[PDB]
């Protein structure tokens, strides 16, 4: 039920610094605000210099930190330090015990402070691997034992999005574009489960409608819609969406190869 | 003598609550005595706990910084006994961070080497990588050749 909302600039600065430090792990701090018990919002990030030793407690640099703080004050960015990013390149997202102790050093600052692990290399143009969570593949380290996972979402202002739109100009390329497949897996599934759901509704309307007059039936059902029209209706989206879905791939395979 | 087991039995404590009463020179000093008498005792548990009770930030003071070479040197010896490695390498790292042994070229070589050998013996894992790849880029490591 608990969650964090990670603004775009945070996420991009994140992945940038991470990808830039490869193949060594980088750390930094997270600026935001705690809405309620159920939420942490992260609007900002700044990057913490390298250390001779690995990412660790003293890697956090007071001088550097406050030195950044005030200079953000002058920009009005004033926020708490709500968590700290990090990266475990190639190793997936989990906290080593050494990650843990530091996480505690951020518990005693604020009890709700969170840990964010980013994984630059295997995060790729598909799904981005990211994780945020706090203490008490990954189960080897006691995913649930010493600590526990959290959830993540992304705040987007209208204008933000509007900038992001113009990145790709798809106006020429449309029609060879194949939309995300997993999404049409939930599509082609939930659609079918639904058709099942209204099947026996159409069954009940044919039996009841059989033994009861139309004038009586209307009184009952006018509230909802004619389950025969959810068959007639719902069959379509599956039909044509799946025919363009098939054809599009049939073309990309033979044409593009 | 080996009877320092019998004697040192008492000083496995006597430092305990004298924390604020002693001055850290002497204080820490015979904490270190507790260490080496604990290893020569052949018992690492009190070396371990009697060790960690010191607080590292005392190493802001160059005075105590001169001393702590002993401290880490022991922590090495312990960890070697425990068959830990990555930990050893973190210590040798830390001593290797000392200005005094940063300077002298005849100081930091045999420690730098050991840092290599242990980062080699440690099992592949998280901190092994970035520790290695940091060493990899240390200019001084150029001066060594085979180890390089
Ligand atoms: Zn880590």
CSV table of C-alpha atoms and ligand atoms in Angstrom, one decimal:
chain,number,residue,atom,x,y,z
A,1,UNK,CA,0.0,0.0,0.0
A,2,UNK,CA,3.0,2.3,0.6
A,3,UNK,CA,4.5,3.9,-2.5
A,4,UNK,CA,6.9,6.5,-3.8
A,5,UNK,CA,6.4,8.9,-6.7
A,6,UNK,CA,9.5,9.7,-8.7
A,7,UNK,CA,9.5,12.8,-10.8
A,8,UNK,CA,11.0,12.5,-14.3
A,9,UNK,CA,14.0,14.7,-13.8
A,10,UNK,CA,14.9,12.5,-10.8
A,11,UNK,CA,14.7,9.4,-12.8
A,12,UNK,CA,16.7,10.7,-15.7
A,13,UNK,CA,19.4,12.2,-13.6
A,14,UNK,CA,19.5,8.9,-11.8
A,15,UNK,CA,20.0,6.7,-14.8
A,16,UNK,CA,22.4,9.2,-16.3
A,17,UNK,CA,24.8,9.1,-13.3
A,18,UNK,CA,24.4,5.4,-13.0
A,19,UNK,CA,25.2,4.7,-16.6
A,20,UNK,CA,28.1,7.1,-16.3
A,21,UNK,CA,29.8,5.4,-13.4
A,22,UNK,CA,29.9,1.9,-14.9
A,23,UNK,CA,31.5,-0.4,-14.1
A,24,UNK,CA,31.7,1.1,-10.6
A,25,UNK,CA,28.8,1.9,-8.4
A,26,UNK,CA,27.7,5.5,-7.7
A,27,UNK,CA,25.7,7.0,-4.9
A,28,UNK,CA,23.7,10.1,-4.3
A,29,UNK,CA,20.9,11.7,-2.3
A,30,UNK,CA,17.2,12.1,-2.8
A,31,UNK,CA,15.2,15.3,-2.3
A,32,UNK,CA,11.5,15.2,-1.6
A,33,UNK,CA,8.7,15.2,1.0
A,34,UNK,CA,6.6,12.7,2.9
A,35,UNK,CA,3.0,13.2,2.1
A,36,UNK,CA,1.5,10.6,4.5
A,37,UNK,CA,2.4,7.3,6.1
A,38,UNK,CA,1.6,5.8,2.7
A,39,UNK,CA,3.7,8.0,0.4
A,40,UNK,CA,7.1,9.4,-0.3
A,41,UNK,CA,7.5,11.9,-3.2
A,42,UNK,CA,11.0,12.4,-4.7
A,43,UNK,CA,11.2,15.5,-6.9
A,44,UNK,CA,15.0,16.0,-7.0
A,45,UNK,CA,18.4,14.3,-6.8
A,46,UNK,CA,22.0,15.3,-6.6
A,47,UNK,CA,25.1,13.2,-7.1
A,48,UNK,CA,27.7,12.2,-4.5
A,49,UNK,CA,31.4,12.1,-5.3
A,50,UNK,CA,33.3,8.8,-5.5
A,51,UNK,CA,35.2,7.4,-2.6
A,52,UNK,CA,38.4,5.4,-2.4
A,53,UNK,CA,36.3,2.7,-0.7
A,54,UNK,CA,32.9,1.5,-2.0
A,55,UNK,CA,29.6,3.1,-1.4
A,56,UNK,CA,29.3,3.3,2.3
A,57,UNK,CA,28.5,5.6,5.3
A,58,UNK,CA,31.4,8.0,5.1
A,59,UNK,CA,30.9,8.1,1.3
A,60,UNK,CA,28.2,10.6,2.2
A,61,UNK,CA,30.0,13.9,2.3
A,62,UNK,CA,28.8,16.5,4.8
A,63,UNK,CA,30.8,19.3,3.3
A,64,UNK,CA,29.6,18.4,-0.2
A,65,UNK,CA,26.1,17.9,1.0
A,66,UNK,CA,25.3,21.1,2.8
A,67,UNK,CA,27.4,22.9,0.2
A,68,UNK,CA,24.8,21.6,-2.3
A,69,UNK,CA,21.9,22.3,0.1
A,70,UNK,CA,22.3,26.1,0.4
A,71,UNK,CA,23.1,26.4,-3.3
A,72,UNK,CA,19.8,24.8,-4.0
A,73,UNK,CA,18.2,27.0,-1.3
A,74,UNK,CA,19.0,30.0,-3.5
A,75,UNK,CA,17.0,28.1,-6.2
A,76,UNK,CA,14.1,27.4,-4.0
A,77,UNK,CA,14.5,23.6,-4.1
A,78,UNK,CA,14.4,23.2,-0.4
A,79,UNK,CA,13.4,19.7,0.5
A,80,UNK,CA,14.3,17.0,3.0
A,81,UNK,CA,16.7,14.2,2.2
A,82,UNK,CA,14.2,11.5,1.8
A,83,UNK,CA,16.4,8.6,0.7
A,84,UNK,CA,19.6,7.8,-1.2
A,85,UNK,CA,20.2,6.2,-4.5
A,86,UNK,CA,22.9,3.8,-5.3
A,87,UNK,CA,23.6,1.3,-8.0
A,88,UNK,CA,24.5,-2.4,-8.1
A,89,UNK,CA,25.5,-2.8,-11.7
A,90,UNK,CA,25.0,-6.3,-13.0
A,91,UNK,CA,24.0,-7.6,-9.6
A,92,UNK,CA,20.3,-6.8,-9.7
A,93,UNK,CA,18.5,-4.8,-7.1
A,94,UNK,CA,19.1,-5.8,-3.4
A,95,UNK,CA,20.9,-4.4,-0.4
A,96,UNK,CA,24.1,-5.9,0.8
A,97,UNK,CA,24.5,-5.8,4.5
A,98,UNK,CA,26.9,-2.9,4.0
A,99,UNK,CA,24.1,-1.3,2.1
A,100,UNK,CA,22.0,-2.0,5.2
A,101,UNK,CA,24.2,-0.4,7.8
A,102,UNK,CA,24.2,2.8,5.8
A,103,UNK,CA,20.4,2.5,5.3
A,104,UNK,CA,20.3,2.6,9.1
A,105,UNK,CA,22.5,5.6,9.2
A,106,UNK,CA,19.6,7.1,7.2
A,107,UNK,CA,17.0,5.6,9.6
A,108,UNK,CA,18.2,7.6,12.5
A,109,UNK,CA,17.9,10.7,10.5
A,110,UNK,CA,14.3,10.0,9.5
A,111,UNK,CA,12.4,6.8,10.2
A,112,UNK,CA,10.7,6.7,6.8
A,113,UNK,CA,13.9,7.2,4.7
A,114,UNK,CA,14.1,4.8,1.9
A,115,UNK,CA,16.8,3.1,-0.2
A,116,UNK,CA,16.8,3.2,-4.0
A,117,UNK,CA,18.9,0.7,-6.0
A,118,UNK,CA,19.4,1.4,-9.6
A,119,UNK,CA,21.0,-1.2,-11.9
A,120,UNK,CA,22.6,0.5,-15.0
A,121,UNK,CA,23.7,-2.3,-17.3
A,122,UNK,CA,20.9,-4.7,-17.4
A,123,UNK,CA,18.4,-1.9,-17.3
A,124,UNK,CA,17.9,-1.6,-21.1
A,125,UNK,CA,15.7,0.0,-23.7
A,126,UNK,CA,12.9,-2.3,-22.6
A,127,UNK,CA,11.9,-2.5,-18.9
A,128,UNK,CA,14.1,-0.4,-16.6
A,129,UNK,CA,15.1,-2.2,-13.5
A,130,UNK,CA,14.7,0.0,-10.4
A,131,UNK,CA,13.9,-0.7,-6.8
A,132,UNK,CA,13.1,1.2,-3.7
A,133,UNK,CA,12.5,-0.2,-0.2
A,134,UNK,CA,13.5,-0.1,3.4
A,135,UNK,CA,14.7,-2.3,6.2
A,136,UNK,CA,13.1,-3.9,9.3
A,137,UNK,CA,17.6,-13.3,-6.7
A,138,UNK,CA,17.1,-10.9,-3.9
A,139,UNK,CA,15.8,-13.5,-1.4
A,140,UNK,CA,19.4,-14.8,-1.1
A,141,UNK,CA,20.0,-11.6,0.8
A,142,UNK,CA,16.8,-11.8,2.7
A,143,UNK,CA,14.5,-9.6,0.6
A,144,UNK,CA,11.9,-10.1,3.3
A,145,UNK,CA,14.2,-11.0,6.2
A,146,UNK,CA,16.2,-7.9,7.0
A,147,UNK,CA,14.3,-5.5,4.8
A,148,UNK,CA,11.2,-5.3,2.7
A,149,UNK,CA,10.3,-4.0,-0.8
A,150,UNK,CA,8.2,-1.0,-1.8
A,151,UNK,CA,6.4,0.3,-4.9
A,152,UNK,CA,7.2,3.1,-7.3
A,153,UNK,CA,5.3,5.5,-9.7
A,154,UNK,CA,6.1,8.6,-11.7
A,155,UNK,CA,4.6,12.0,-11.4
A,156,UNK,CA,4.2,13.8,-14.7
A,157,UNK,CA,3.0,17.4,-15.2
A,158,UNK,CA,1.0,18.1,-18.3
A,159,UNK,CA,3.8,20.3,-19.8
A,160,UNK,CA,6.4,17.7,-18.9
A,161,UNK,CA,4.6,15.1,-21.0
A,162,UNK,CA,4.1,17.6,-23.8
A,163,UNK,CA,7.9,18.1,-24.0
A,164,UNK,CA,8.4,14.4,-24.0
A,165,UNK,CA,5.9,13.9,-26.9
A,166,UNK,CA,8.0,15.8,-29.4
A,167,UNK,CA,11.1,13.7,-28.8
A,168,UNK,CA,9.9,11.0,-31.2
A,169,UNK,CA,8.0,12.4,-34.2
A,170,UNK,CA,6.0,9.3,-35.2
A,171,UNK,CA,3.9,11.1,-37.9
A,172,UNK,CA,5.9,9.4,-40.7
A,173,UNK,CA,6.6,6.1,-39.1
A,174,UNK,CA,3.2,5.1,-37.9
A,175,UNK,CA,1.8,1.9,-39.4
A,176,UNK,CA,5.0,0.0,-38.9
A,177,UNK,CA,4.8,0.6,-35.2
A,178,UNK,CA,4.0,-2.3,-33.0
A,179,UNK,CA,2.6,-1.4,-29.6
A,180,UNK,CA,3.8,-3.1,-26.4
A,181,UNK,CA,3.1,-6.8,-26.6
A,182,UNK,CA,2.7,-7.6,-22.9
A,183,UNK,CA,0.0,-5.0,-22.8
A,184,UNK,CA,-1.9,-6.7,-25.5
A,185,UNK,CA,-1.5,-9.9,-23.5
A,186,UNK,CA,-3.5,-8.4,-20.7
A,187,UNK,CA,-5.7,-7.2,-23.5
A,188,UNK,CA,-6.2,-10.5,-25.3
A,189,UNK,CA,-6.7,-12.1,-21.9
A,190,UNK,CA,-8.9,-9.8,-19.9
A,191,UNK,CA,-11.0,-9.4,-23.0
A,192,UNK,CA,-11.6,-13.2,-23.2
A,193,UNK,CA,-12.3,-13.5,-19.4
A,194,UNK,CA,-14.8,-10.7,-19.9
A,195,UNK,CA,-16.5,-12.4,-22.9
A,196,UNK,CA,-16.8,-15.3,-20.6
A,197,UNK,CA,-18.3,-13.1,-17.9
A,198,UNK,CA,-21.1,-11.8,-20.1
A,199,UNK,CA,-21.7,-15.1,-21.9
A,200,UNK,CA,-23.9,-16.4,-19.2
A,201,UNK,CA,-25.5,-13.0,-18.9
A,202,UNK,CA,-26.7,-13.4,-22.5
A,203,UNK,CA,-27.7,-16.9,-21.4
A,204,UNK,CA,-29.8,-15.5,-18.6
A,205,UNK,CA,-31.4,-13.0,-20.9
A,206,UNK,CA,-32.3,-15.7,-23.4
A,207,UNK,CA,-33.9,-18.0,-20.8
A,208,UNK,CA,-35.6,-15.2,-18.7
A,209,UNK,CA,-36.5,-13.4,-21.9
A,210,UNK,CA,-38.0,-16.6,-23.1
A,211,UNK,CA,-40.5,-17.1,-20.3
A,212,UNK,CA,-41.1,-13.3,-19.6
A,213,UNK,CA,-42.5,-10.7,-21.8
A,214,UNK,CA,-40.6,-7.8,-23.4
A,215,UNK,CA,-42.6,-5.2,-21.5
A,216,UNK,CA,-41.7,-6.9,-18.3
A,217,UNK,CA,-38.1,-7.4,-19.3
A,218,UNK,CA,-37.5,-3.8,-20.2
A,219,UNK,CA,-38.5,-2.8,-16.7
A,220,UNK,CA,-35.8,-5.0,-15.3
A,221,UNK,CA,-32.8,-4.5,-17.7
A,222,UNK,CA,-33.0,-1.0,-19.1
A,223,UNK,CA,-30.5,0.0,-16.4
A,224,UNK,CA,-27.7,-1.9,-18.0
A,225,UNK,CA,-26.9,-2.8,-21.6
A,226,UNK,CA,-28.2,-5.6,-23.6
A,227,UNK,CA,-25.6,-8.3,-22.9
A,228,UNK,CA,-26.0,-9.5,-26.4
A,229,UNK,CA,-24.4,-6.1,-27.3
A,230,UNK,CA,-21.4,-6.8,-25.2
A,231,UNK,CA,-20.9,-10.0,-27.2
A,232,UNK,CA,-21.5,-8.1,-30.5
A,233,UNK,CA,-19.4,-5.2,-29.2
A,234,UNK,CA,-16.6,-6.9,-27.4
A,235,UNK,CA,-15.9,-9.5,-30.0
A,236,UNK,CA,-14.8,-6.7,-32.3
A,237,UNK,CA,-11.9,-5.1,-30.5
A,238,UNK,CA,-10.4,-8.5,-30.2
A,239,UNK,CA,-11.1,-9.2,-33.9
A,240,UNK,CA,-9.7,-6.1,-35.6
A,241,UNK,CA,-7.1,-5.3,-33.0
A,242,UNK,CA,-5.8,-8.8,-33.4
A,243,UNK,CA,-5.9,-8.6,-37.2
A,244,UNK,CA,-3.9,-5.4,-37.4
A,245,UNK,CA,-1.7,-7.0,-34.7
A,246,UNK,CA,-1.1,-10.0,-36.8
A,247,UNK,CA,-0.7,-8.2,-40.1
A,248,UNK,CA,1.7,-5.6,-38.7
A,249,UNK,CA,4.1,-8.4,-37.6
A,250,UNK,CA,3.7,-10.3,-40.8
A,251,UNK,CA,4.9,-7.2,-42.6
A,252,UNK,CA,7.7,-6.2,-40.2
A,253,UNK,CA,9.1,-9.7,-40.4
A,254,UNK,CA,9.3,-10.1,-44.2
A,255,UNK,CA,9.8,-6.4,-45.1
A,256,UNK,CA,12.3,-5.5,-42.5
A,257,UNK,CA,14.5,-8.6,-42.4
B,1,UNK,CA,54.6,-15.0,29.7
B,2,UNK,CA,51.8,-17.4,28.7
B,3,UNK,CA,50.5,-16.5,32.2
B,4,UNK,CA,49.3,-13.3,30.5
B,5,UNK,CA,46.1,-15.3,30.0
B,6,UNK,CA,45.6,-15.3,33.8
B,7,UNK,CA,46.6,-11.6,34.1
B,8,UNK,CA,44.9,-10.3,31.0
B,9,UNK,CA,41.7,-11.9,32.3
B,10,UNK,CA,41.4,-8.7,34.4
B,11,UNK,CA,42.0,-6.2,31.6
B,12,UNK,CA,39.4,-7.9,29.4
B,13,UNK,CA,37.3,-5.6,31.6
B,14,UNK,CA,39.2,-2.8,33.3
B,15,UNK,CA,39.0,-0.7,30.2
B,16,UNK,CA,35.2,-1.2,30.0
B,17,UNK,CA,33.6,1.7,32.0
B,18,UNK,CA,36.8,3.8,32.3
B,19,UNK,CA,35.8,5.2,28.9
B,20,UNK,CA,35.4,8.9,29.8
B,21,UNK,CA,37.9,8.7,32.7
B,22,UNK,CA,40.9,7.7,30.6
B,23,UNK,CA,42.6,9.8,27.9
B,24,UNK,CA,42.4,8.3,24.5
B,25,UNK,CA,46.2,8.0,24.1
B,26,UNK,CA,46.6,5.6,27.1
B,27,UNK,CA,43.0,4.4,26.9
B,28,UNK,CA,43.0,3.2,23.3
B,29,UNK,CA,46.6,2.3,23.9
B,30,UNK,CA,45.9,-0.5,26.3
B,31,UNK,CA,42.8,-1.4,24.3
B,32,UNK,CA,45.4,-2.3,21.8
B,33,UNK,CA,47.2,-4.2,24.5
B,34,UNK,CA,44.0,-6.1,25.1
B,35,UNK,CA,44.0,-6.9,21.4
B,36,UNK,CA,47.4,-8.4,21.1
B,37,UNK,CA,47.3,-10.2,24.4
B,38,UNK,CA,43.9,-11.5,23.1
B,39,UNK,CA,45.5,-12.9,19.9
B,40,UNK,CA,48.5,-14.3,21.8
B,41,UNK,CA,45.9,-15.8,24.1
B,42,UNK,CA,44.6,-17.4,20.9
B,43,UNK,CA,41.1,-16.2,21.5
B,44,UNK,CA,39.5,-13.9,18.9
B,45,UNK,CA,36.1,-13.2,20.5
B,46,UNK,CA,37.4,-10.6,22.9
B,47,UNK,CA,39.8,-9.4,20.3
B,48,UNK,CA,36.7,-8.9,18.2
B,49,UNK,CA,34.4,-7.3,20.6
B,50,UNK,CA,37.1,-5.5,22.6
B,51,UNK,CA,38.1,-4.2,19.1
B,52,UNK,CA,34.9,-2.9,17.7
B,53,UNK,CA,34.1,-0.9,20.8
B,54,UNK,CA,36.5,1.9,19.7
B,55,UNK,CA,34.9,4.6,17.6
B,56,UNK,CA,36.8,5.3,14.4
B,57,UNK,CA,36.1,9.1,14.2
B,58,UNK,CA,38.9,9.5,16.7
B,59,UNK,CA,41.1,9.2,13.7
B,60,UNK,CA,40.5,12.8,12.8
B,61,UNK,CA,43.4,13.5,15.1
B,62,UNK,CA,46.8,13.0,13.4
B,63,UNK,CA,48.1,11.9,16.8
B,64,UNK,CA,45.8,9.0,17.0
B,65,UNK,CA,46.2,8.5,13.3
B,66,UNK,CA,49.8,7.5,13.9
B,67,UNK,CA,48.6,4.9,16.4
B,68,UNK,CA,45.8,3.3,14.4
B,69,UNK,CA,48.3,1.6,12.1
B,70,UNK,CA,48.5,-0.9,14.9
B,71,UNK,CA,44.8,-1.1,15.1
B,72,UNK,CA,44.3,-2.0,11.5
B,73,UNK,CA,47.4,-4.3,11.4
B,74,UNK,CA,45.7,-6.4,14.1
B,75,UNK,CA,42.3,-6.3,12.3
B,76,UNK,CA,44.2,-7.8,9.4
B,77,UNK,CA,45.7,-10.5,11.6
B,78,UNK,CA,42.3,-11.4,13.0
B,79,UNK,CA,40.6,-11.4,9.6
B,80,UNK,CA,43.3,-13.6,8.2
B,81,UNK,CA,42.5,-16.0,11.0
B,82,UNK,CA,38.8,-15.8,10.2
B,83,UNK,CA,39.7,-16.6,6.5
B,84,UNK,CA,37.9,-13.4,5.5
B,85,UNK,CA,39.5,-11.5,2.7
B,86,UNK,CA,37.4,-8.7,1.2
B,87,UNK,CA,37.4,-7.4,4.7
B,88,UNK,CA,41.1,-7.6,4.9
B,89,UNK,CA,41.4,-5.7,1.7
B,90,UNK,CA,39.1,-3.0,3.1
B,91,UNK,CA,41.4,-2.6,6.0
B,92,UNK,CA,44.6,-2.5,4.0
B,93,UNK,CA,42.8,-0.1,1.8
B,94,UNK,CA,42.2,2.1,4.9
B,95,UNK,CA,45.8,2.0,6.2
B,96,UNK,CA,46.8,2.6,2.6
B,97,UNK,CA,44.8,5.8,2.8
B,98,UNK,CA,47.2,7.2,5.4
B,99,UNK,CA,49.1,10.4,4.4
B,100,UNK,CA,52.2,9.1,6.2
B,101,UNK,CA,52.2,5.9,4.1
B,102,UNK,CA,50.8,7.7,1.0
B,103,UNK,CA,54.1,9.6,0.9
B,104,UNK,CA,56.8,7.1,1.4
B,105,UNK,CA,57.3,5.0,-1.7
B,106,UNK,CA,58.9,2.2,0.3
B,107,UNK,CA,55.9,2.2,2.6
B,108,UNK,CA,53.0,1.8,0.4
B,109,UNK,CA,54.2,-0.8,-2.1
B,110,UNK,CA,54.1,-3.9,0.1
B,111,UNK,CA,50.7,-2.8,1.4
B,112,UNK,CA,49.4,-2.0,-2.1
B,113,UNK,CA,50.5,-5.5,-3.2
B,114,UNK,CA,48.6,-7.2,-0.5
B,115,UNK,CA,45.6,-5.1,-1.4
B,116,UNK,CA,45.8,-6.7,-4.8
B,117,UNK,CA,46.4,-10.3,-3.6
B,118,UNK,CA,43.4,-10.2,-1.3
B,119,UNK,CA,41.1,-8.5,-3.8
B,120,UNK,CA,42.1,-11.5,-5.9
B,121,UNK,CA,41.4,-14.0,-3.3
B,122,UNK,CA,38.1,-12.6,-2.2
B,123,UNK,CA,35.1,-14.3,-3.9
B,124,UNK,CA,33.5,-12.6,-6.8
B,125,UNK,CA,30.8,-10.3,-5.6
B,126,UNK,CA,29.5,-6.8,-5.2
B,127,UNK,CA,32.2,-4.9,-3.5
B,128,UNK,CA,35.0,-6.9,-5.0
B,129,UNK,CA,34.2,-5.4,-8.4
B,130,UNK,CA,34.2,-1.7,-7.6
B,131,UNK,CA,37.1,-2.2,-5.3
B,132,UNK,CA,39.1,-3.9,-8.0
B,133,UNK,CA,38.1,-1.5,-10.8
B,134,UNK,CA,39.1,1.3,-8.5
B,135,UNK,CA,42.5,-0.2,-7.8
B,136,UNK,CA,42.8,-0.7,-11.6
B,137,UNK,CA,42.7,3.0,-12.1
B,138,UNK,CA,45.0,4.0,-9.2
B,139,UNK,CA,48.0,5.5,-10.8
B,140,UNK,CA,50.3,4.1,-8.2
B,141,UNK,CA,49.4,0.5,-9.3
B,142,UNK,CA,51.2,1.4,-12.5
B,143,UNK,CA,54.5,1.3,-10.7
B,144,UNK,CA,54.0,-2.3,-9.9
B,145,UNK,CA,54.3,-4.6,-12.9
B,146,UNK,CA,53.5,-8.3,-12.4
B,147,UNK,CA,50.8,-7.5,-9.8
B,148,UNK,CA,49.5,-5.0,-12.4
C,1,LIG,ZN1,25.0,-1.5,-2.8
